[PDB]
Design a protein around this ligand. Structure first.
Ligand SMILES: CO[C@H]1[C@H](O)[C@@H](O)[C@@H](O[C@H]2[C@H](O[C@@H]3CO[C@@H](O[C@@H]4CO[C@@H](O)[C@H](O)[C@H]4O)[C@H](O)[C@H]3O)OC[C@@H](O)[C@@H]2O)O[C@@H]1C(=O)O
Ligand SMILES: CO[C@H]1[C@H](O)[C@@H](O)[C@@H](O[C@H]2[C@H](O[C@@H]3CO[C@@H](O[C@@H]4CO[C@@H](O)[C@H](O)[C@H]4O)[C@H](O)[C@H]3O)OC[C@@H](O)[C@@H]2O)O[C@@H]1C(=O)O
Ligand SMILES: CO[C@H]1[C@H](O)[C@@H](O)[C@@H](O[C@H]2[C@H](O[C@@H]3CO[C@@H](O[C@@H]4CO[C@@H](O)[C@H](O)[C@H]4O)[C@H](O)[C@H]3O)OC[C@@H](O)[C@@H]2O)O[C@@H]1C(=O)O
Ligand SMILES: O[C@@H]1[C@@H](O)[C@H](O[C@@H]2CO[C@@H](O[C@@H]3CO[C@@H](O)[C@H](O)[C@H]3O)[C@H](O)[C@H]2O)OC[C@H]1O
Ligand SMILES: O[C@@H]1[C@@H](O)[C@H](O[C@@H]2CO[C@@H](O)[C@H](O)[C@H]2O)OC[C@H]1O
Ligand SMILES: O[C@@H]1[C@@H](O)[C@H](O[C@@H]2CO[C@@H](O)[C@H](O)[C@H]2O)OC[C@H]1O
Ligand SMILES: O[C@@H]1[C@@H](O)[C@H](O)OC[C@H]1O
Ligand SMILES: O[C@@H]1[C@@H](O)[C@H](O)OC[C@H]1O
Lengths: 436, 436
């Protein structure tokens, strides 16, 4: 299939997953999206240290199993997250250090993997062991202070506890090859492979924002690690601003590296995100697909063989030959758009932004004042509303994110002056458009 | 006085007010802004029919006076809202009809206005009496069915109750001069003035959104009513998306009309708005000034020395004489901007959008990574986060909405290559810019 992320990803032998929060599984809107779109699941917090071993020697898998049960019940595989980490440690562990901490770490790994033995596709055995100071050294934590060999020990312990699981090292800010952190993790994984330390994969969290922006060299980073003899996976993907282009670039980088197993986005809806303020996911608050969703799906399906109209560009309806035109090149908010013979005039030059807007005049946005059929499509000052965002489906249609309705040439008209509206998508030619 | 809205408006003998919610007067974050920025107050709900006369003949002014006193104590006048309206009527009035309802209306007016006699600057005597059906006729309500002369009666009663208060007719969707509703109200006020019906003002709610967009002819409307011999007031202003241009346009419309008494925005922070989802106010939920706030203040203070660049222009540093430049015309997210000899190149053409972004290349935005001093200012895909929105102060400084910090040429550098950072505003020449 090529209508859902999971199925689409499956076409390249890859998976596409998300992070599930057990407390949200009772929300039908949430489960409807999660069950339909993803074939891989990571427990957002339920399989972490504090959640699985609340008191020393006392393991608890109720929260984890709620996530796990839902995943397999809906045909999804599971990534275990996470066994050894400096963050979210229960209180009893935070007060530990030295050999006592080292053995507790080992005991924890054995306890959790044993419970899920043979049920987990991948395990993030160790998470965020490297520093962000910019030196590429080890993060200064209670775990690292027990000895530099703690990571190696964690992996050897894991392989023995469940030899069927892929053992991954997971971390963030290791996507840009030029960053010292990236090279530090590289050198470690390389040392591991050379000495026989058990490690099958490297997880790239991929938490992209203006602080740590995506960079095209992410592909070389993936290639480099792949070349060490380990699989790579994008494990916690989310992009501040949810740029359509950035989301597509990440998708293509993974599909460009044969060893990239798949892509997991850290959440379902922006409102579910640990950083909802960055509206970084593929679905918005009310559960509708965002422009980035379409871009990701299209990339997974191979995309197209016609370079997207970078900056400016007309939109012509295949069923009329007329171009999306703004009546007499007006810049008056509330002006309903129309169909008109194509010509080189700004009032016909539309830019599809990475945020999903169709801009004209540089600061006016294609706007819908309503969500029902017959809603007049117009121009209005750009402010980022969902009624100003659109998805350009590969089938040639342009759907409104908020409405879920398609741009429709009223009454299937085709003569100049034909007004544009929103209407239940119909493969009709009065709803298909071509970039130029 | 010109660092706050009220004080700036006062320079032209006008006021800039807000709608106060009695329940928020206990929130210091709320009152800190409210007491500082406005010199006119309207009770958001405390002076309405159901709130002042819970039972016929039994008036309750506790909540109302609470707001009234807070206002006067903090140096603000008050607009009484509202005496006769089809909405928010107590249960007992909603069932009355004909004469009994007519007398109930008259009594209500005498009761409330009697209590506040001589204390109120303006009274919205009658609210929303016209239909949106396109006919330009009266709205069908129990009040209108008491007889078409109800509006006239309400005003005559009001004049008698308190001859010292300015009596206003208040409505929405009467801003666009071409609308039937508008002409419907225009004709009524003209008639009233000709027949001597006591009416001193017309309140334009000014609730703008894609459904009923702002139109430049709003000024024409204000001037037309003004010519009739009545004052005009912007009573409940809020703009969907809070466009800087629209907010500035409305402010200038009032400044262009001698009879325009002032402007009231319907709320303090976006989170206090009856339409919070449209983030239509001047302050963010965190209390920070939005791009539109500065646009209004600048308008109230007069504006810029020269007509601001309408999209596309250089930004030259006063101290250095050099322009804001994107190194090597790079389009890579995360590229920090610099100062460089000014020249006609796209990597120096910045467009200030209505939303407050500073765009370059069309879909790239001036972006701040963090919120502290030294934070790098760079370019990043446009998505509309507050770290991508800026206020153009009249002193030449450019402030980040989210950080509240100024664009600053590092170390006061003036040479080519000087990097741009965020830093506490200092009025230094390395923090001043000219739109050229
Ligand atoms: C107590 O106040 C805040 C906490 O400061 C804040 O961390 C958060 O804590 C929640 C907890 O949030 C988890 C944190 O982990 C996220 O996933 C990680 C993201 O970074 C990657 O590098 C890691 O690999 C990921 O595992 C996850 O998405 C968040 O949901 O969840 C459990 C809660 O009990 C805890 O309080 O929120 C609290 C707060 O809002 O009160
Ligand atoms: C489902 O219940 C909802 C109501 O539907 C919703 O209106 C709101 O009602 C509150 C009420 O809200 C007031 C309504 O008036 C607003 O101001 C008017 C806006 O329109 C202009 O034309 C008028 O001139 C203005 O006066 C004001 O901003 C809102 O705060 O306040 C009193 C509450 O008792 C009532 O429930 O919210 C309820 C709800 O959420 O339960
Ligand atoms: C065809 O003429 C072109 C030039 O080929 C083109 O380079 C440009 O030249 C401008 C000049 O552009 C500056 C050059 O410096 C850039 O910043 C550099 C960033 O990396 C650092 O290592 C360097 O030291 C920095 O200089 C800056 O971003 C560009 O804007 O600016 C001065 C102009 O007089 C010169 O012509 O543009 C011309 C052109 O189109 O006219
Ligand atoms: O209250 C205001 C003060 O906070 C403000 O302080 C100035 C802040 O900038 C200082 O100069 C910066 C030093 O660091 C460099 O990197 C920057 O480029 C410089 O601009 C300046 O020395 C402080 O005085 O001054 C104005 C007060 O009203
Ligand atoms: O908890 C972790 C955060 O502390 C971490 O923060 C990163 C710090 O460096 C910045 O450049 C990054 O943008 C920022 O995300 O991010 C990962 C998260 O798991
Ligand atoms: O209560 C009033 C609302 O009913 C009114 O609704 C307007 C109806 O026309 C649409 O075009 C507008 O977008 C919509 O806001 O708005 C004013 C409010 O006071
Ligand atoms: O918008 C149309 C314009 O593009 C064309 O040039 O003239 C007719 C107008 O309606
Ligand atoms: O144009 C619309 C057409 O596409 C739809 O199928 O039926 C209603 C028409 O108005």
């Amino acid at each position: 299939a090529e209508s859902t992320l999971g199925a689409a990803a499956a076409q390249s032998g890859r998976y596409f997953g998300t992070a599930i929060a057990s407390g949200k599984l009772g929300d039908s809107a949430y489960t409807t999206i999660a069950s339909r779109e993803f074939n891989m699941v990571t427990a957002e917090n339920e399989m972490k240290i504090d959640a699985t071993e609340p008191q020393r020697g006392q393991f608890n898998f109720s929260a984890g199993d709620r996530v796990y049960n839902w995943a397999v019940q809906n045909g999804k595989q599971v990534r275990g997250h996470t066994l050894a980490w400096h963050s979210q440690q229960p209180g009893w562990m935070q007060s530990l250090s030295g050999s006592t901490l080292r053995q507790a770490m080992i005991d924890h790994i054995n306890g959790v993997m044993g419970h899920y033995k043979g049920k987990i596709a991948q395990w993030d055995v160790v998470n965020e062991a490297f520093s962000d100071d910019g030196s590429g050294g080890r993060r200064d934590s209670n775990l690292q202070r027990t000895g530099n060999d703690w990571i190696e020990v964690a992996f050897r312990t894991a392989r023995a506890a469940d030899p069927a699981a892929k053992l991954c090292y997971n971390d963030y800010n290791i996507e840009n090859w030029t960053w010292a952190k990236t090279q530090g993790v590289y050198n470690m994984v390389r040392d591991f492979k050379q000495r026989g330390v058990p490690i099958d994969c490297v997880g790239f969290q991929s938490h992209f924002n203006s602080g740590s922006p995506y960079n095209s060299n992410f592909r070389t980073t993936l290639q480099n690690f792949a070349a060490l003899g380990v699989d790579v996976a994008i494990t916690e993907l989310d992009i501040q601003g949810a740029s359509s282009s950035t989301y597509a670039a990440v998708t293509n980088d993974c599909l460009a590296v044969s060893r990239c197993l798949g892509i997991t986005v850290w959440g379902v809806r922006d409102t579910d995100s640990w950083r909802s303020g960055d509206t970084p996911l593929l679905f918005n608050g009310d559960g509708s697909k965002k422009a980035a969703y379409t871009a990701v799906l299209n990339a997974l399906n191979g995309g197209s063989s016609t370079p997207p109209p970078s900056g400016g560009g007309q939109i012509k309806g295949v069923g009329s030959g007329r171009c999306l035109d703004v009546p007499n090149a007006s810049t008056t908010d509330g002006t309903q758009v129309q169909l008109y013979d194509c010509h080189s005039a700004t009032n016909q030059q539309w830019t599809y932004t990475d945020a999903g807007e169709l801009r004209v005049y540089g600061d006016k946005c294609l706007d819908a004042a309503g969500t029902g059929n017959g809603t007049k499509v117009q121009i209005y000052s750009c402010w980022g509303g969902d009624n100003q965002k659109w998805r350009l489906n590969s089938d040639g249609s342009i759907v409104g994110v908020q409405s879920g309705l398609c741009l429709d040439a009223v009454g299937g008209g085709t003569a100049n002056g034909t007004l544009i509206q929103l209407y239940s998508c119909s493969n009709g030619s009065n709803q298909r458009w071509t970039r130029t």
